[PDB]
Amino acid sequence: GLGTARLQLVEFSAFVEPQRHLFVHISQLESVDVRQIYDKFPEKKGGLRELYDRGPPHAFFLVKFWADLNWGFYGVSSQYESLEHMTLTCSSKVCSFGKQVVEKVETERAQLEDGRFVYRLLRSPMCEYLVNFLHKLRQLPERYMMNSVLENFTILQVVTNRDTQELLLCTAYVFEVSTSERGAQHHIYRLVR
């Protein structure tokens, strides 16, 4: 599972609408040494090197996606849950060639539902840099070319309790493109050092 005692990821999806086409989808555990991907993020130190230290270690995950890119409004929807009432700050960073080219910060208040609190960040428009990048990627003639380009791209999502500034979740995402027969797939991993 992608989560901790305090906050669990319940659903994540990135999609385009004219039904939906889902690039990646998670609906709800091997490990990986941080040092394996250190170079994929910067050392602003707003890439992982400085942030993992501050801790706690159990809040850090790596997700690998095999995206389905064979298919307007481009969106992202995420939903988390917890037993405690918080306000969440969600920082999302896109890193390209070791540099941070996007940072998106959003804030979501708890909603009471069925004896738990849910945090619904629904249909957040995908930022324009990504829509444009996807359009280009979509142009490439071969999948191995898409994957060459994507090896230089990573996303980091940091979720923090806004009122205390405690880190609840830190997730790194890396991407490849699957073949259409093989739909999208993900694998979630713990990060350790």
Ligand SMILES: O=C(O)c1ccccc1Nc1cccc(Br)c1
């Ligand atoms: O949706 C956005 O605008 C965004 C901005 C910064 C980092 C990630 C973002 N969305 C996104 C898009 C596809 C997969 C994943 Br994980 C996240």
